[PDB]
Amino acid sequence: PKKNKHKRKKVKLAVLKYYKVISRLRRECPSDECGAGVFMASHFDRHYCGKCCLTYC
Amino acid sequence: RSGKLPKAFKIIPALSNWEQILYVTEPEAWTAAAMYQATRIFASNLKERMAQRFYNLVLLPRVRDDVAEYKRLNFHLYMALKKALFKPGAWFKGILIPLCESGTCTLREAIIVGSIITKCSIPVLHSSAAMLKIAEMEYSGANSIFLRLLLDKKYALPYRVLDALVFHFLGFRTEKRELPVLWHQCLLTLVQRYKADLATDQKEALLELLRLQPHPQLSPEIRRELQSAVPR
Amino acid sequence: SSVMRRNEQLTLHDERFEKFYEQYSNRLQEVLNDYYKWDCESICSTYSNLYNHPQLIKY
Amino acid sequence: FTYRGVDLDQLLDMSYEQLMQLYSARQRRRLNRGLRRKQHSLLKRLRKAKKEAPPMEKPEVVKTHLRDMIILPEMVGSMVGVYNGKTFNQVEIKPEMIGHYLGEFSITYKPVKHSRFIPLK
RNA sequence: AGUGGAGCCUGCGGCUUAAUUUGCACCCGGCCCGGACACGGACAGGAUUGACAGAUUGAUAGCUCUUUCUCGAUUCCGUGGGUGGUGGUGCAUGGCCGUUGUUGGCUGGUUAAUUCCGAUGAACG
Ligand SMILES: [Zn+2]
């Protein structure tokens, strides 16, 4: 039952999925500190901002 | 003791009037794990300057009077100080240097935060700033420990920093007061790491320093390392 | 500062120190509402000593 | 089955406050002194276990350390596992179990299961 | 007068036990952390930090198990019979206590009450 430390999933080129060719494939955080680059996590039911932690469903 | 923190406590990094919020939270009455979590949230998602203000106001007097009380550092306090080290610039300008001109730093706090220095890799530019701002200030029994350990970091030393350090050693010409074996240990680490970056005038300068300030045990090592140094 | 200086051999970087010495809400109400039988010695009696004997050469 | 001349259906329909007189003095004093947060917590967990069960067979097993629950008629039919210090014992709450503590049904100790010289010369 | 007999309680042994701690110390489960030095690996194509929600769990929890958002050099992987340091421990060692007379000198609430809390010096031998 030894506690193994968590290891981050090193995904190849995490940046290369929010754009085309131009536009934003993910929407933008509408907050004050967040926007114009703070991209929106889109899980299968829900939406996440990684800085200010807004909960959008 | 344990369990999830309230979500009203994790919004203080984004909260404006932080001073009254922390004051009504009574900073002197915290426990160790709560302070560790506070340093975590104020060193992870926070900026530089108000995190530095946090380091000045709360963390430094608490660690100071705690090691005054118990002559050791608590486990959660050590983790909190490491998490404060996770942001380099705020920690240097908020914890290390304020304790440096505090003047009342003891040997135990110095060796504890020097061990904390040695346990993590720091940026070279912040280390050079630390060496400049510690060489510009007066000598005690505590700042030399950071001199010795941050020379033991063995980074690419800027040469203005070297001029400042040798200018401090110029500051020690004719004083009679017996500086300890740790002084010669700092000189030993300096001549062990940066003997290849010294010009000739530095060589005879430390030679006449050796003549004026002798040591029955480590000074032959200083003569050996000065005489066996490859010029830059 | 000082007066005895480099004089030779390739200063790499330019040693920025000017930032060190001279340095010295709907979500609020939202989270406010969110607030409220054998051993090693006995088994030796099991082993026999009468099966695989080498053939004996007599005198 | 009946308990003090009362059947289980209206026992579930009886109140919390006048069920108290049907029990013994220890249980009545405990019900006087209130139940704590873990008590209603495991009550909600066993209710959730009963709710998500298919209606033909018994629900899933809910396990706990908490040995000082009094078995109430709400819990009749539940699948409860109680820690006896080392392991969990899984037991079905019968209607006959209606007064006792849960900790009576997982014993924390094991039963104790425990040549003369004759002269030859 | 007893004890040694009987029932019950207790102490050492011994036996059972995960433990039946010992001349809360014990047991069963869950957290948290845990060197530098050297050399070889990964690292801006990205090292690594933080995290809502759901779950495992006896319970919750980015301290873990899912799904991605963000912090970016504040780095993290392996091998050493090489040291070791928030270690424990004695000696020499500098400062500092205590140790081997005499005469003076009220905003506030609160109670039976100059009640309670609360702000608020000198010489002589
Ligand atoms: Zn945002």
Curated annotation (Swiss-Prot), chain A:
Residues bearing N6-acetyllysine are K17
Zinc finger boundaries on the chain: C4-type: 29-52
Q: Which domain of life is it from?
A: Eukaryota
Q: What is the protein's quaternary organization? A: Part of the 40S ribosomal subunit. Part of the small subunit (SSU) processome, composed of more than 70 proteins and the RNA chaperone small nucleolar RNA (snoRNA) U3.
For this entry, the protein name equals: Small ribosomal subunit protein eS31
Annotated function:
Component of the 40S subunit of the ribosome. Part of the small subunit (SSU) processome, first precursor of the small eukaryotic ribosomal subunit. During the assembly of the SSU processome in the nucleolus, many ribosome biogenesis factors, an RNA chaperone and ribosomal proteins associate with the nascent pre-rRNA and work in concert to generate RNA folding, modifications, rearrangements and cleavage as well as targeted degradation of pre-ribosomal RNA by the RNA exosome.
Q: Give the position of the cross-link Glycyl lysine isopeptide (Lys-Gly) (interchain with G-Cter in ubiquitin).
A: K20
The part of the entire sequence present here spans: 88 to 149 of 156
Q: What compartments host this protein?
A: Cytoplasm; Nucleus, Nucleolus
Q: Which residue spans adopt a coiled-coil conformation according to this UniProt entry?
A: none
UniProtKB/Swiss-Prot annotation, chain B:
Distribution of this protein across tissues and organs: Found in the placenta from the sixth week of pregnancy. Was localized in the cytoplasm of the syncytiotrophoblast in the chorionic villi and in endometrial decidual cells at the uteroplacental interface. After week 10, the level decreased and then disappeared from placental villi.
Q: Where is the signal peptide?
A: none
Where is this gene product found? Cytoplasm; Nucleus, Nucleolus
Q: Does the keyword Cytoplasm apply?
A: yes
Q: Which UniProt keywords apply?
A: Cytoplasm, Methylation, Nucleus, Phosphoprotein, Ribosome biogenesis
Q: Which residues carry this modification: Phosphoserine?
A: S219
Its family?
Answer: Belongs to the bystin family.
**What function does this protein fulfil?**
Required for processing of 20S pre-rRNA precursor and biogenesis of 40S ribosomal subunits. May be required for trophinin-dependent regulation of cell adhesion during implantation of human embryos.
What is this protein called in UniProt? Answer: Bystin
The gene coding this protein:
BYSL
What range of the full-length protein does this chain span?
Answer: 196 to 427 of 437
Curated annotation (Swiss-Prot), chain C:
Q: Where in the cell is it found?
A: Cytoplasm
**Which residues, renumbered to this chain, carry the PTM Phosphoserine?**
S2
Which segments cross the bilayer? none
Q: What is the superkingdom listed in this entry's lineage?
A: Eukaryota
Report, as the record phrases it, the tissue specificity of this protein.
Answer: Expressed in the epidermis.
Q: What does the UniProt record say this protein does?
A: Essential for ribosome biogenesis.
Linked disorder reads: Inflammatory poikiloderma with hair abnormalities and acral keratoses: An autosomal recessive disorder characterized by mottled hyper- and hypopigmentation of the skin, sparse scalp hair and eyelashes, sparse or absent eyebrows, and palmoplantar keratoses.
Q: Which family does it belong to?
A: Belongs to the LTV1 family.
Question: What protein name applies here?
Answer: Protein LTV1 homolog
**Span within the parent record:** 247 to 369 of 475
UniProtKB/Swiss-Prot annotation, chain D:
Extract the Gene3D superfamilies matched here. 30s Ribosomal Protein S19, Chain A
For whether the record's keyword set contains Nucleus, the answer is no
Q: Which UniProt keywords apply?
A: Acetylation, Cytoplasm, Isopeptide bond, Ribonucleoprotein, Ribosomal protein, Ubl conjugation
The GO terms this record gives for MF are: DNA binding; MDM2/MDM4 family protein binding; RNA binding; structural constituent of ribosome; ubiquitin ligase inhibitor activity
Q: PROSITE patterns from the xrefs? A: RIBOSOMAL_S19 (PS00323)
One GO cellular component this record assigns the protein to is: membrane
Localisation per UniProt entry? Cytoplasm
Residue spans crossing the bilayer: none
Q: Name one GO biological process term.
A: ribosomal small subunit export from nucleus
> Site of the Glycyl lysine isopeptide (Lys-Gly) (interchain with G-Cter in SUMO2) crosslink?
K94
InterPro entries per UniProt: Ribosomal_uS19 (IPR002222), Ribosomal_uS19_CS (IPR020934), Ribosomal_uS19_euk/arc (IPR005713), Ribosomal_uS19_SF (IPR023575)
Instruction: Using the record for this protein, list the coiled-coil segments as residue ranges, or answer none.
Output: none
Self-association and partners = Component of the small ribosomal subunit.
Q: Provide the family line.
A: Belongs to the universal ribosomal protein uS19 family.
Q: What does this protein do?
A: Component of the small ribosomal subunit. The ribosome is a large ribonucleoprotein complex responsible for the synthesis of proteins in the cell.
- Stated name of the protein: Small ribosomal subunit protein uS19
Classification lineage: Eukaryota, Metazoa, Chordata, Craniata, Vertebrata
